[PDB]
Amino acid sequence: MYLRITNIVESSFFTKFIIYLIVLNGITMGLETSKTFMQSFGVYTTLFNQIVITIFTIEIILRIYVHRISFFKDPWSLFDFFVVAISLVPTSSGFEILRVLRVLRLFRLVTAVPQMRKIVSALISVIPGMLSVIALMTLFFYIFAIMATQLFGERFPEWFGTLGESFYTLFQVMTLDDWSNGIVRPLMEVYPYAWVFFIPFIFVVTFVMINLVVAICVD
Amino acid sequence: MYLRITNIVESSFFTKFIIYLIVLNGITMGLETSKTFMQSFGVYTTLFNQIVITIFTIEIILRIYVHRISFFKDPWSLFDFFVVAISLVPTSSGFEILRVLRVLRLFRLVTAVPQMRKIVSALISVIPGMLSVIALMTLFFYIFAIMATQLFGERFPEWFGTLGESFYTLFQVMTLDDWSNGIVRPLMEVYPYAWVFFIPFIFVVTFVMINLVVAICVD
Amino acid sequence: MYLRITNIVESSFFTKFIIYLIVLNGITMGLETSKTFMQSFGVYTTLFNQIVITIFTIEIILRIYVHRISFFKDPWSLFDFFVVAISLVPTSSGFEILRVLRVLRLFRLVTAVPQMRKIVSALISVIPGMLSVIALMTLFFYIFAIMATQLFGERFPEWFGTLGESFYTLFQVMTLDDWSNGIVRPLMEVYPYAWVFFIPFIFVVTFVMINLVVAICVD
Amino acid sequence: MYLRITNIVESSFFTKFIIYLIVLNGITMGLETSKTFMQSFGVYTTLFNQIVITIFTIEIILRIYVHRISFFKDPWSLFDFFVVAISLVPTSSGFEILRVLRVLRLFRLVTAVPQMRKIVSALISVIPGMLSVIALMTLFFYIFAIMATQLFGERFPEWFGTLGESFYTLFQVMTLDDWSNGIVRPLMEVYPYAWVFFIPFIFVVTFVMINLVVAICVD
Numbered sequence A, B, C, D: 001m002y003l004r005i006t007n008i009v010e011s012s013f014f015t016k017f018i019i020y021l022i023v024l025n026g027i028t029m030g031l032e033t034s035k036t037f038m039q040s041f042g043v044y045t046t047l048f049n050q051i052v053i054t055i056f057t058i059e060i061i062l063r064i065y066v067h068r069i070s071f072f073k074d075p076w077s078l079f080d081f082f083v084v085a086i087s088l089v090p091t092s093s094g095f096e097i098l099r100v101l102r103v104l105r106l107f108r109l110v111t112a113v114p115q116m117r118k119i120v121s122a123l124i125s126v127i128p129g130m131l132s133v134i135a136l137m138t139l140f141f142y143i144f145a146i147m148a149t150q151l152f153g154e155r156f157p158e159w160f161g162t163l164g165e166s167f168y169t170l171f172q173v174m175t176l177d178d179w180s181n182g183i184v185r186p187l188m189e190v191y192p193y194a195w196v197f198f199i200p201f202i203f204v205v206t207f208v209m210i211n212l213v214v215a216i217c218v219d
């Protein structure tokens, strides 16, 4: 039966039948957004949903027999597996993010269609060349985030009161979002010199970030 | 009469006369802005406007004879038809946006002068080589916009209460506009972990956009 | 005496003496900032200033005889003339900006010291190859500023009340500064569809500006 | 005893041992952040902290006998000295920022591990190609900072009342952070024409910065 089904899985129909379901279930998830629509056709799309989830596991089952070890060494397939798994955890118990993480299946449209895969891949492959920078920066953030927790945390605990909080605040300064009126000016009402901490921090982080962008245009 | 008028339309005088109307009507439309100017010369400029609009249809009526099917396959020509057409819809009924859309005719200064034509074209030609990335993002946006509507829209309906609103809010985060003090710090007063949604969201969307710019500095 | 003075002017000492004055009058102007310093050395500096102004008009007079027509065809020289000229308008009558505009003479450090001239020129030289874009944009800004004044200026006259005001608001949106919480969300409380005007505006204006930068990163 | 210790210092186990202490002491400093943790294992830490500092001076002492003058001509080696030095100043007295500055030793992770060294150096090496532009800007900032202090500092002394404040505010406009609703719109409630000062300032500063970025995308 193997070659029989290996001809079902590889079929242009089967793959395009999947793509057809993704665009359908996607359309169906934007409808589940409407409180109004749920009062009309709630039960329609709840069944239609459970339906698709089976179809996608049947596929991922069929997909596994045909590929065996090759399937659990394919990024795109591994993905597809995990995104269906999440979609399998019972409509109850534990966390309810799992009910929300179910919308992650529409990322299969990125998997089941090339060019998307191409472009996603094109994007990802730049990451390794950045890891050298990304490491530098994380050490940098970690260092300043400690100083800040221990320099501003007592008077300004919302923003720097915890190592995590300082990370968040520092991230926020880095995106330059409301950084002066929102943070440094307040801080300076108490700590006149806080500008000595954040201006250098901004230069560095802004400089480094600019280099990272030119690095991705040297290749 | 065809070759006669094919020599009127195609003349340098015709074109340079058209350009002369645009820059004149453009000046007249900046004057219709002043409530003062309208209490003095409102009559002058309302007539002058209908005048140019006649002249512009006469010209477009002419232009079509000289080109027939070649005209309706020219982007720039199609444009002027549509833009004059909007200017044709009566100063009444329906919407008043049509009254406002009339100022779109000043885009003819782009259509009826080269280099502009060159520059616009230069720009537009970059779009197809973005469609792969653009598609990716619009799916990403759609996915999170759904996720966000169902994670935050009950307590925070202004921002995420509706699919559309999530799109708007997510766009705003993407432009990094007042995203932390304005939206996420609030959101975290109720959902401490909201930072787990927006920081990843920000990297992805920021990353991708850096590539789309590096892509345009390659082709 | 002409070759005597052409040997005075063209001398290294002359140039290095001018540069020496600029850095001194520059230092002396940062001191006229202090209300404290002015109460202890106000006169010291005001005389020193009137002094330097002489020394620079003497120089410019010398400089002119040595170059005649070659001078009023040198940008950098013209500059120095006009900048010193400003410094010549009496401490009274007229606008008081001319008193403030005096500090523009410190830009002579750019003009009278090479490598600044180089870098400045290097910068300026990029402007012509942007005039095509810059014109495009200005037309665009002009067209939308008109639309916005007649779409939003009745209920929102601070922001869009006048054609000039619209320009400013539109500039602000383009620098993406507090555009959503600060402007469009307000505007939407009245004009729900205002988002239809500002999102496309942002796309266009942001797109164009990316091209203009990639344009520069090619020439 | 020299070649004995020269072989100890140059040993891989020596280096790897240091890198081990850094990643250990880094983890220790992040724990000193928890107010909870210090009530539990503060003592455990503070003594381990002094231990590491002992070890690190010993290393730097060893490293000097084995390099002499070659040491104090090595940037990285100099760094480590001036970093451990900081950590040597007692837990008491005059500036307590020194207790905070101790955390700068985590930058030794950059100094000891290569690749980081590589990347940091790659970053630094872009600086000299910017000094021509940096100097230009700093002169620019200085000139406008002066004009502003004397144009706006009487009514707006928070923002422009002092040369330093003008510098800060001008930096903030440059990062485009809350520059219009936050600052210029206010300023215009008194000085209608303040837009004549800041829009040009923004262009220049924005333009320049774009060139500096492209200038890097060359070298």
Ligand SMILES: [Ca+2]
Binding pocket: A175, A176, B175, B176, C176, D176
């Ligand atoms: Ca920004």
Ligand SMILES: [Ca+2]
Binding pocket: A176, A177, A178, B176, B177, B178, C176, C177, C178, D176, D177, D178
């Ligand atoms: Ca901002």
Ligand SMILES: [Ca+2]
Binding pocket: A177, A178, B177, B178, C177, C178, D177, D178
């Ligand atoms: Ca803001």
